[PDB]
Amino acid sequence: AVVKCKPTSPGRRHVVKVVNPELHKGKPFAPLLEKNSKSGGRNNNGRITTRHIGGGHKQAYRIVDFKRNKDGIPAVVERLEYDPNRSANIALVLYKDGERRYILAPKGLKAGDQIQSGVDAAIKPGNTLPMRNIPVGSTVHNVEMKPGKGGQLARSAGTYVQIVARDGAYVTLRLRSGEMRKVEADCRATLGEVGNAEHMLRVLGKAGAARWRGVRPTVRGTAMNPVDHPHGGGEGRNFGKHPVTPWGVQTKGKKTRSNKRTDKFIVRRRS
Amino acid sequence: MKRTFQPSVLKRNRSHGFRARMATKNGRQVLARRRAKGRARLTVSK
RNA sequence: CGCGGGGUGGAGCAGCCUGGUAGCUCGUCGGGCUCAUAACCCGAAGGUCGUCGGUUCAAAUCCGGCCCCCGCAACCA
RNA sequence: CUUUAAUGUUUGAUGUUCUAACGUUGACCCGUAAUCCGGGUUGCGGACAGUGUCUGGUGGGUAGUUUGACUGGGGCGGUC
RNA sequence: AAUUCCUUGUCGGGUAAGUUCCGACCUGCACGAAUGGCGUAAUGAUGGCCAGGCUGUCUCCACCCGAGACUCAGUGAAAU
RNA sequence: GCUCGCCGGAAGACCAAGGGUUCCUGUCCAACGUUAAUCGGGGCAGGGUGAGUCGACCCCUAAGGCGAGGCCGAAAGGCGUAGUCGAUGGGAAACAGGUUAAUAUUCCUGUACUUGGUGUUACUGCGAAGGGGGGACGGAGAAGGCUAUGUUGGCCGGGCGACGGUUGUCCCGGUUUAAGCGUGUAGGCUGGUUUUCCAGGCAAAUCCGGAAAAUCAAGGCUGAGGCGUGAUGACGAGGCACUACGGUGCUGAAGCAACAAAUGCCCUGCUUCCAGGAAAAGCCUCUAAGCAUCAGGUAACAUCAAAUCGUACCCCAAACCGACACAGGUGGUCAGGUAGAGAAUACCAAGGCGCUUGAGAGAACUCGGGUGAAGGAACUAGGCAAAAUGGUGCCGUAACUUCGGGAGAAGGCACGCUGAUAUGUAGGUGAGGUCCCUCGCGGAUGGAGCUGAAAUCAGUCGAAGAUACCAGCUGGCUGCAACUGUUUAUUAAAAACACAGCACUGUGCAAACACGAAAGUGGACGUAUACGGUGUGACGCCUGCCCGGUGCCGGAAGGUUAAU
RNA sequence: AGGACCGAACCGACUAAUGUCGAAAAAUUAGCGGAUGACUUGUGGCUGGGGGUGAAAGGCCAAUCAAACCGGGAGAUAGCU
RNA sequence: GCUUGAGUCUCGUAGAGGGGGGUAGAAUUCCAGGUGUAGCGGUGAAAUGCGUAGAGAUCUGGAGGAAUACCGGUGGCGAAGGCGGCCCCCUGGACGAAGACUGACGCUCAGGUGCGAAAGCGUGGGGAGCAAACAGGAUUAGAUACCCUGGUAGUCCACGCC
What we know:
- This is part of a larger assembly, with chains A and B.
- Chain A contains one helix and 15 strands; from the N terminus they run ββββββββββββββαβ.
- By secondary structure, chain A is an all-beta fold.
- Chain B is an all-alpha fold.
- Chain B has three helices and no strands.
- The termini of chain B are far apart.
- The chains are: A mainly beta, B mainly alpha.
- Chain A binds six RNA strands through strand 3, strand 13 and helix 1.
């Protein structure tokens, strides 16, 4: 769980690490690795589309099975690995047929468990099945958006989607951020919450703690110039303007929700 | 002080070389003028 | 030096703007209440409108000189 | 003239449903060893969304510009 | 006070003498609670102040060692 | 040539880069060189760069570029799939000695190695743009085993030495040896083998994976160095012999032991922690489409081929970049003796240089420095500059505190040399002898030789024992900022910025926002414990009142309201 | 273990002196800060002019930057010298 | 040694004793829709607030959180604080019955350790109602009180602290 380091040096007097003994300290499973490129925040044009991103540290991409398209075949959890790309753990599982894959490590799952996908599986953390067979009131994650897509919602650590009701062909999901969205019942999900729940408890402490994570220093507006930003200028910290983004759009209170092809689906707004 | 000209032939021939000019319309417009001025050193090469 | 505003019963403030009749509250006085006070109730007195002069049928009011007060300004070498 | 009622008729503002336009950065197959793309099945939305024209609004994000003169130097005050 | 114009405010400490410094009183021209406030161990090629030590910084400079300066030969400019 | 001085983790010796004959020989001095010049990187003429094993080209890819079709765009053009290019990455193979005026792991001598073709003999199933294994990988820390290398000793050769001594524990020189092959060790990794079955590996599979069993307990992979061999070979100090007197020819002894020990190697190991650490090919292996008296593959042998390009010289600088023969800048490797923790530093070894104007004088004055009576900041904007502190072991050390520190706080004591404990201790290394054995690079036991701190006592020398170079000034109060870090390249290094943390708010993923006329990307192959914007800026106690003005959000009944 | 300490190579550039028609179109000398990390460096690509980039100074983009260089509008225009 | 102290074993009884995991009912607030209409709320009187944008009343449905009417009683349990809808699981203590057994193991206990209402604090969630602080309206000589309409922290849960 959580562990607080010692104040032996300036920069280590505030860091808090999250220790997980059940993590596989060995090497990552070879067959599921491919080259992931760091962009630095640039597009095809090479200009910075999104700032504050770059540098960091080299990490390898792991093909994780969100889809869970295999069915009715029990698996054996081999070992829990720490995934570089995700804020949650991943479980290296193996089915009874001899194929190994990675699934998002749920909350209640240990080394040496049994999980299966399909509608034949009963209720237990890890099992994946369509929502029209799942009892309402339950807790899931990795919910699909379009049937067969694979799963998109609440994948990070601790996130969980609770199901409110089932209106026949449409089931109601009460999202993580209080939002109420409906989804086609044919979609799948995975019972139980996502592990590594103490991810939020971790504090960075140092400055480079964010640097190797892949971040760049963020500069404030009232330290810039008129030619470089709406703020800045003056002769001693003069703000006096309504806070806007580096492109003029008023922030701190402005709904930019504009999709309209999906406004039938959102039932409740964040409040 | 580090002077503003560290020679590196490969970097010289890829960015300002003959072929790089020959690949684009603008470069070809450039090559058009060089012949229009009767210049001997058309591009930069060995 | 210049610009704007103000000075009204004992006090703090309206009314001047667009001239003829000055109001609100506290305070004060006499009475009532309560054994006595405050509070509350009834009734009333109290104002040279900073000062002087002019314009006008008529000046707190329109304007000017002067006196006191408040704010702004008194900067660039 | 007012208030009004049955019918016929005319279009308009909303509501529900369907599938052919269209969307599909869902699943699958072929071209094809190719996660681009095109076509073909199927499922899901659905005459919306999105786009062109006209148009109201917001708008220093962006651009072109204005911001007087006399003045015992200029500014300020004042004048024209 | 990185804020106090009036001001070198007044009082006490430090010096023989302190417009700086340190501790307080509140008369805050015109502090103030994320354009964050009051403190804070450590840290700082940081601002201000005091003491020890140490010396040419100074009282007042004195001598010596080398590179130029001066002379001789060769070469041979510049601003204007 | 005889002396002197200078650098010596460089001012030495080699590469990449980049230049482009500047390298070498002869000859020449007008012009270039900041002076003269028979001199030179300057003119003129000639010579020199020799490769299957070095590097490049080649095979294979990353960032990214081009991009058939395709999507999109007034045009130009942009993006992008299959493919195709592109190293600073990975993939086959050589070392020693000698030789030139100049080049040599390329030439010669000696000894080896690698990738393929053709043919032969004996066996046998081979075969992809397809699957798998492998290739294939991080930071940091410590230990063990060695090597380059250095010292001493033994031995060999020479000398016994121009002022006193030196046949002896004396002095000087030399004591070098690879690639490859065999052995397969210190150490490290891991349970092998066999039978059977399967929705796993876009299809298949005897290969990989998984699931049941039997048998036996080891087998196997990897691996520097050592020992043999390579080698009765080469080299080798010094003599012997000819001088164009620069050097060439000839001959040639000792060639071992011990100790210390790398930042190099085993190690592209092992442990631990976290920020979690390429891709593809070569190679190995299994099959489909197919082909089978074939073709191909395994092994041995013989022969042939291993092409093209660069190779000179400078390469921490007069040859590169700075207009200059410019006190600057330039990545990588090898890297010794004594003192020392050390690649600091001091003086030297190897090697290479004295910086291409000097000769005299010793004025003021200027710069780089040495010393200074007495006082010691009185200087001055100000302790700016100098001065002084300065190492090791040990003694000891406050307020405050986030209980880590503060702190090497401050302030102190001993430091040389000789003998003794001890003809050099503890310790390290470790042969001979004795013994056993699953017999070899083995293990116990054994202990000579070698090497070597430091502690204590006693004695003695100078004024001074960390004697030089080298090498902290410290304490008190207090403002700002938490601290490391970053920035005005070339007048501002700070209290400015960043920072982790916190708060607010937008976004339900074809997400918000941004680049782009569009497509397409980033955001993210991540999805609310995520991402974008803003403000403040560790941490402790907190963070009060106002919705009038502006902005924003919510609701839309009424008035008004463009085009149509 | 440490954005840990003292301190070389390396990087950076706080103080003074010298230099300023310098040896140098920001250097040298005597002292300095960092020095296992937000470090530094080589090779090779990508982003570009109302844009790029920026631990943000309106700094940097070939010694030039509150809008680079070259050619063309263009012999711009000038109540000014 | 003995046994009348104390302790233990066999069988049962009653209980809001403590802890963890679920479920159920009424009511409250908000959200959405239909019916429907000028008031609703509140008090000592009234006002702020809500309402023709259509409230309150009423019906249907949904989302949620907290406390558990009647049983309930100077009844019960535990050392105390303190604890009550129900259910499963783990489990402590107390009492009774007829006997056996160990054989004084006992009592108290500074220091010390542990538990310890509420309020309050820190990290992270949730957030119906109630409600410090606070604004507004009244009472009043004044009301930064008593009252009313709103209303944050907190009140609830997990892990520590006080």
